[PDB]
Amino acid sequence: RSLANAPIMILNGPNLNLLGQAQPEIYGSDTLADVEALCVKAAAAHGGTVDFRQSNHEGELVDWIHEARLNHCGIVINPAAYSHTSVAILDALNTCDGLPVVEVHISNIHQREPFRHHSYVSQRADGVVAGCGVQGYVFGVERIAALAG
Amino acid sequence: RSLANAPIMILNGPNLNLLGQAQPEIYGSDTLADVEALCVKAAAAHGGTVDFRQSNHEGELVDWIHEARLNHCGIVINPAAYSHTSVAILDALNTCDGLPVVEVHISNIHQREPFRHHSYVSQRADGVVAGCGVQGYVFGVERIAALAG
Amino acid sequence: RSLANAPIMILNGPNLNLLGQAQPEIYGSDTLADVEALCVKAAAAHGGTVDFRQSNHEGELVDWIHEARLNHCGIVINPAAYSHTSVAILDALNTCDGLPVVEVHISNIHQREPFRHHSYVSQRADGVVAGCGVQGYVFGVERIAALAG
Amino acid sequence: RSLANAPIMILNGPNLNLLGQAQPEIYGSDTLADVEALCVKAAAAHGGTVDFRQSNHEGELVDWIHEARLNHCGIVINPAAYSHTSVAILDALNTCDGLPVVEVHISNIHQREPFRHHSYVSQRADGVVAGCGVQGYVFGVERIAALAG
Amino acid sequence: RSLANAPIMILNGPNLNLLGQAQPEIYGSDTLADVEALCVKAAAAHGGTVDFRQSNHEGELVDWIHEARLNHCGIVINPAAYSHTSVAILDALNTCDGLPVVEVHISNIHQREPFRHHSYVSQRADGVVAGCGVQGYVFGVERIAALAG
Amino acid sequence: RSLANAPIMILNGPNLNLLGQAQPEIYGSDTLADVEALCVKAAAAHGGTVDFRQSNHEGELVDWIHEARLNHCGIVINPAAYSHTSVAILDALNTCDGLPVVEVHISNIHQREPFRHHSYVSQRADGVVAGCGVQGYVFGVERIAALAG
Amino acid sequence: RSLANAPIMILNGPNLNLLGQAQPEIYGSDTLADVEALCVKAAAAHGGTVDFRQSNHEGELVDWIHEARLNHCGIVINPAAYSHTSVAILDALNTCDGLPVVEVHISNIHQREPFRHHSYVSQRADGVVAGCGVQGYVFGVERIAALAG
Amino acid sequence: RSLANAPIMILNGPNLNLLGQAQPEIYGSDTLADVEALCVKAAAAHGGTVDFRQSNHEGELVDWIHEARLNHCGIVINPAAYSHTSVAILDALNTCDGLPVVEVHISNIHQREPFRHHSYVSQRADGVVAGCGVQGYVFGVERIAALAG
Amino acid sequence: RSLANAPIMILNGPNLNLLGQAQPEIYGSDTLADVEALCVKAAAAHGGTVDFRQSNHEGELVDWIHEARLNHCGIVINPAAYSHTSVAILDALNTCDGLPVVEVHISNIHQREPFRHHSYVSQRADGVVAGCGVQGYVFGVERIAALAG
Amino acid sequence: RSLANAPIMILNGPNLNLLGQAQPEIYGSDTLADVEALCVKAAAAHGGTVDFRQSNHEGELVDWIHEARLNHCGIVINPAAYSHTSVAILDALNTCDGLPVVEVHISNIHQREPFRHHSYVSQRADGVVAGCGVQGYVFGVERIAALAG
Amino acid sequence: RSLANAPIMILNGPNLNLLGQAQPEIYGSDTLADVEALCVKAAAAHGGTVDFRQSNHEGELVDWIHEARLNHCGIVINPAAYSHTSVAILDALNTCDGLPVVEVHISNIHQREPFRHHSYVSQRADGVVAGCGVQGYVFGVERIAALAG
Amino acid sequence: RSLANAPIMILNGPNLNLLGQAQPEIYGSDTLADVEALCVKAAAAHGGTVDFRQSNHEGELVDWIHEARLNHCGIVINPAAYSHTSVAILDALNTCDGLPVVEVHISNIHQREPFRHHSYVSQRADGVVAGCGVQGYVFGVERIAALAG
Ligand SMILES: O=C(O)[C@@H]1C=C(O)[C@@H](O)[C@H](O)C1
Ligand SMILES: O=C(O)[C@@H]1C=C(O)[C@@H](O)[C@H](O)C1
Ligand SMILES: O=C(O)[C@@H]1C=C(O)[C@@H](O)[C@H](O)C1
Ligand SMILES: O=C(O)[C@@H]1C=C(O)[C@@H](O)[C@H](O)C1
Ligand SMILES: O=C(O)[C@@H]1C=C(O)[C@@H](O)[C@H](O)C1
Ligand SMILES: O=C(O)[C@@H]1C=C(O)[C@@H](O)[C@H](O)C1
Ligand SMILES: O=C(O)[C@@H]1C=C(O)[C@@H](O)[C@H](O)C1
Ligand SMILES: O=C(O)[C@@H]1C=C(O)[C@@H](O)[C@H](O)C1
Ligand SMILES: O=C(O)[C@@H]1C=C(O)[C@@H](O)[C@H](O)C1
Ligand SMILES: O=C(O)[C@@H]1C=C(O)[C@@H](O)[C@H](O)C1
Ligand SMILES: O=C(O)[C@@H]1C=C(O)[C@@H](O)[C@H](O)C1
Ligand SMILES: O=C(O)[C@@H]1C=C(O)[C@@H](O)[C@H](O)C1
Structure with missing residues (x-):
């Protein structure tokens, strides 16, 4: 599916x-709403749209991935803690044959504790x-636009 | 309990x-409904019944195992990704003193990535x-049957 | 906040x-209700109160830490199996700048399997x-009463 | 080849x-002969036959695997200690392109010492x-029957 | 023994x-004499008494554990660096069949260097x-009073 | 340092x-010259310029990093194999107090051999x-322009 | 059980x-026949006898252990290189419920390569x-004598 | 010994x-008889002769190494799976003071599974x-010929 | 030195x-006094004598090794827990050029926890x-007698 | 390319x-000039020629590999210490699609330190x-001739 | 404290x-009295004095480190085996806020066994x-002189 | 060679x-020219001279080591990053049979990141x-003076 026909899913x-609001010295002072606005603006320059969501539940993220598999043109995801722990989210992305996927971490995880x-x-x-801070979400939108198109 | 007095819980x-529908080259083309039918049939030949369920949520699975502990004759479980990550599911099963438990994986996890x-x-x-493919749930039910006796 | 102005969050x-009810040889014969009343009594001796809660869901535990972050004077937490697996809960606790936190395990996890x-x-x-058995929750309460002062 | 045209090799x-006779609390009280009878009965239900053998010698198992490669419709194997040590049996199985193979362990090796x-x-x-006890051989035979048809 | 019949040994x-006096940012500004008074006060609320000692010698700590084995109702020990190195202190404790033992660390060792x-x-x-700071010794004494009864 | 005042150093x-020309299925069919023209246009969109270089020599890349430290407004680097082996290139970048640095790998190294x-x-x-393929370089340039701003 | 009723199996x-004849600087200059005579005289000093055997074949050693299980009063064994690789010989000795077993190495394996x-x-x-050299075999025979009586 | 006075032992x-016949994409389509004829030809070019043998049994290989020790001018050996597992064949080779030994693998083991x-x-x-394929056997003969000489 | 000219130091x-007195199921019911009587009798059969000591102090053990280096004909040592942790005791035995040394553990350490x-x-x-139980000491005495001869 | 059309690149x-000149007990007493002569002679027997070079610089060895990729019929390389540390030389050889390549070590690395x-x-x-000593270079040349032919 | 006001503690x-006297091929033929004279001399050239001591006992070492903390200008320590095992001696030094400390090993521990x-x-x-031999004590003293300065 | 006949090589x-100029809080504020002057002065007191060099290139350092092998009395080297990565420079130094070598690191590498x-x-x-700071190079010069003397 192209960006003209279906939105980019953006999962958090x-x-x-x-x-x-929390740990601004590590993750910045921009809010999740500020990040959604960046994403919308980047997709609109390519003629696309975004579906931007956040969850603390592993299984809800699994379900949204399944939804994107059928309805969206790609996925930008910041899995947050679940990057390090969830084989279930990996597996959900693996059911998405050929769908473009870009992972984003606000912080440089390679500078932090070894578990990250x-x-x-x-x-x-x-x-x-x-x-790349919240700018990394915009890079994610631009990479999906290049892959879908 | 016996098979005649309570259903076998089949968890997914x-x-x-x-x-x-997804990754058929790994997991085959039979559906979860097909698997449920295989289980009903195998339990029937032993005078038993099944209670077949699927969930994306680790805590829901926990809840279902608590239910089984009191109302079911045994559990056949395919924990899927949670097999590799869930200490919480292990601990739920450990509350079930003496309840027969059979773990099933469709794919041969020992030929796959090391994290599996x-x-x-x-x-x-x-x-x-x-x-053993989806036939391994049939083996599961048969083994519950033998043990519940 | 102070113990007079906000309850202590007690999370299980x-x-x-x-x-x-289960594995009494490892975890004792006192119930969660019993623990709650120990906690209520210990907090009352310091002029405080408790907000006592349990869940099988990693994401609900995250959400209740976020609530504590704003409304409670400290947290006493028994993460149970999530202690071993959940980077998400650790991160939730990390967003709580300066809020007193005390972890409690009923059993001596250091004498158990290496994954614990x-x-x-x-x-x-x-x-x-x-x-220190369920008496560890009273220790927990006592330590938050000292840190909040 | 088919179950009607060639026997299933059962190697122990x-x-x-x-x-x-030995360690009945781990492996049970049914004998090797009892297992052979279970196998003969399971295969006869599918119109097949078995060739059941046992050896303490690694090279003799490798020799038997080579024979099956040419004359048998599949292999059900409990390699016993050799599971954990024999790259030479693994290699013998690797020469049998396309032959169905099912490995059987009477005890749950995952609950035993780490070298198992x-x-x-x-x-x-x-x-x-x-x-799955000695019932696991019956599983084995049923799985070869499915794969060889 | 019992708290009315024998003292609680408190070993450092x-x-x-x-x-x-040293590293107050890690271990606080209360002295060992201060900790002794807190211990004395906690035990006296249960009608007990304490026998409070410190040593920089591994063999001496071993000899004091032997003494406790015969004359004391339980042991609250803060092994300090020996926690990490001393199989001999573990083994002395192991000779004390059934005697209640509570280990105390002033600092949260889990947040420090991996060797700790x-x-x-x-x-x-x-x-x-x-x-839990020097307050953990009071928790220690309380636990021993609960176990010794 | 500003984009107006000095070029972005692009090191390969x-x-x-x-x-x-080589391994097009892993690294694409765009040339290094093609990447250089992408970089010149990306920097131009921010009023900036680039100094694009490539070398097979670890010590030469060290020397170019020292040069950058004094004369450039940031560094985009694709260390290629040296990413995995060069403590010396890490240390050269450590000499560059506060200079923006962005590392780019064409291929997704986390899907490849574990040494990568x-x-x-x-x-x-x-x-x-x-x-992100050669588009990563463009992202690299954009992040330097935002960090230099 | 008794030395009077059955010989001590000595397996090499x-x-x-x-x-x-080979590597005398590691294993000495006494021959295997010289060791057999030592073992005859040591067992004779207790009124016993020995059945002394050597094989390069893992399976043959397994079969002699099963023989011993039924017909001998204990086993002294020098597994040589199979000490480090044979799970199969371990398993054969575990079938020997209560039979006294002493393992002997001529060389001090703890001074040699880590795989030993x-x-x-x-x-x-x-x-x-x-x-303890070939004198270790005499020690083994004395230990079996002490365990059988 | 010398090549004119004793044969080269070639062991498989x-x-x-x-x-x-098996896995020709890994090991080639030349047979073991073809290999033997390569070896005969190479040895004859140096005035020598070979003694070519194959076995699935670890103990037999050990016995043949012992024979060579006394009767052959060197050993070219392809230990196949027992390269990875047999401390016993290693130790057999170690009894052969000074005898030239060349190990040959047809496949490049370093590109295969880590256990290889x-x-x-x-x-x-x-x-x-x-x-080096089956030509590696010719290289082994030539090397034995330079070391015997 | 020889057995006739100097005693055998036996360190515990x-x-x-x-x-x-403690953990008799692991170390037996014979006392240290009973073990010294065994050693005295075994030494006396070879015309030697023994100097039998025990300490809880690692440094004292070092001092007594030093003393043995000059005044004794060999050392039998049961290092107990310091086996596992004392590089200092290893190093004291390394200063003892050529002195016979036999280490003895009552229990089979290879069947206990991995730190042992x-x-x-x-x-x-x-x-x-x-x-080998306390009999291990007698085998120690006997080995020093053969080595000091 | 055939051996008649282009030289074999021999890199050191x-x-x-x-x-x-240095460490002759490890690497022998033949010089690099001696080695080149051996190679020239072996190539000439197959109607080919060699291009023999040596370098201390990792980048120069990478550049020469690039040259070979276009102008040579195969490569024989002794990477020396870069064997163990150079991902960069590995990647240079990976750009050479289908070019025959044989690695040579003079010493038997497997007997040396574990970093080798x-x-x-x-x-x-x-x-x-x-x-195989400097004769391994002749084996390299021989293999190239068989692979190019 | 300055070198003029207080001696340098030299610990062994x-x-x-x-x-x-022992292992001169590793540690040389100079004695501890020789090393003390070297320290006295080097301290004298800076107007300083030394307090040279040796102990086999870990806790004595700890006690001397506490004395230095209050009465000495700095510590030159050769912890010998305790280097590898003593967290207690590391924690003693860590109580000495800002006191110059230099660690000396006579032998190059990096060429020896991995536990060193x-x-x-x-x-x-x-x-x-x-x-650096016993000369490394001289280096110690000189460094203490530069840092107390 | 002595210090009177040949210069000490000081490699950086x-x-x-x-x-x-860079990271002065780790490496100090003395320059490389200041270090060379400290080495010239230390050597002069022993009647010797220095040959002080620096390079970023691994192979140029190998070349310089080869030089020193034939023309210098010993080598003082601060390999810097290459300490951790270069088997090549290790090997270069291994060609220098009997030449005194001292390695110096300005900063205490054991307190930094584990790859150092x-x-x-x-x-x-x-x-x-x-x-020992830059004073460690003076220690180096002093140690070569003793070893060359
Ligand atoms: O950088 C990010 O956005 C990540 C966000 C988190 O919440 C962490 O758990 C991850 O480690 C990193
Ligand atoms: O083979 C199975 O059924 C498993 C199914 C999955 O979902 C994986 O996560 C598990 O790794 C394996
Ligand atoms: O002791 C406790 O309370 C912990 C309780 C849990 O449920 C376990 O998962 C933890 O491992 C231990
Ligand atoms: O359970 C099985 O049948 C196996 C039987 C054996 O003998 C063991 O060596 C295996 O580890 C397990
Ligand atoms: O926190 C404590 O009381 C401990 C005190 C010590 O001295 C350290 O050795 C331990 O690591 C921690
Ligand atoms: O992906 C890149 O651009 C990097 C390209 C290289 O050359 C490899 O060595 C790296 O491993 C990856
Ligand atoms: O010391 C012995 O008797 C042993 C003899 C062998 O043959 C070795 O393989 C063992 O490793 C040690
Ligand atoms: O390459 C060969 O000749 C080897 C052949 C075997 O049979 C294997 O087991 C080895 O792993 C490789
Ligand atoms: O078996 C013995 O004698 C040993 C005695 C001890 O005290 C233990 O610490 C050892 O681990 C074993
Ligand atoms: O054997 C040789 O040719 C190799 C040559 C080197 O220089 C070493 O670095 C290698 O480790 C071994
Ligand atoms: O080199 C030194 O001075 C050391 C001396 C000791 O006694 C050893 O234990 C150390 O490992 C090293
Ligand atoms: O301390 C030194 O002098 C070292 C200097 C370097 O450049 C680092 O890379 C080394 O890690 C340390």
């Missing part, structure tokens, strides 16, 4: 509802952006 | 809703079947 | 709803109590 | 000659059954 | 003679308290 | 001279982009 | 046929003697 | 009897040839 | 003063006896 | 300029020769 | 009493000298 | 050209100084 993992250096999502994601 | 973990090699559920499960 | 993870030896919550909790 | 590794958790044979076997 | 390992994550003593202690 | 590691999973450069780079 | 692993530091036989052997 | 391990990467025989062999 | 590590499998002493000991 | 890594046991080059090289 | 761990590779003291010592 | 690895803990150079260097 656990604790991201507090972006811009590995992500299960990365083994499926076509592209992985880390430590 | 994340992504199993898309069985037969280990299951938490397997330390509590009485029996473990892997790589 | 998965399977702890069965406390006193490490907890994600312990890198954030101020204090960790293990193997 | 070292120490299995003492089945039913890994099996060389499992990387080639199509299916792997563990902890 | 190496460098705790400088408590209050493991403790030998923890596999024998009944209970372990970490990161 | 060993073997990138052959880009578009770790990069010494990622511990210093502000941002890391992998698996 | 692979390459022990060459003892005294672990023995599978040592988890079943009641006693293990290493680096 | 388990499954090599099927060379040319280590050979116990490589620590004693003088030279090791891998991935 | 921490907690062995309680032998016969490694001994620093065994890389220096000429011989190592484990799991 | 760091420190091989001193071959025959793994080579990055070996995952790409078609054939690997180790411990 | 276990077995060092035998320096010059790691030092606990090294994480706190300001400088670490290894393999 | 990558990034050292910015000593004193190991040095390949340290397995050949006679002595190793770390964390």
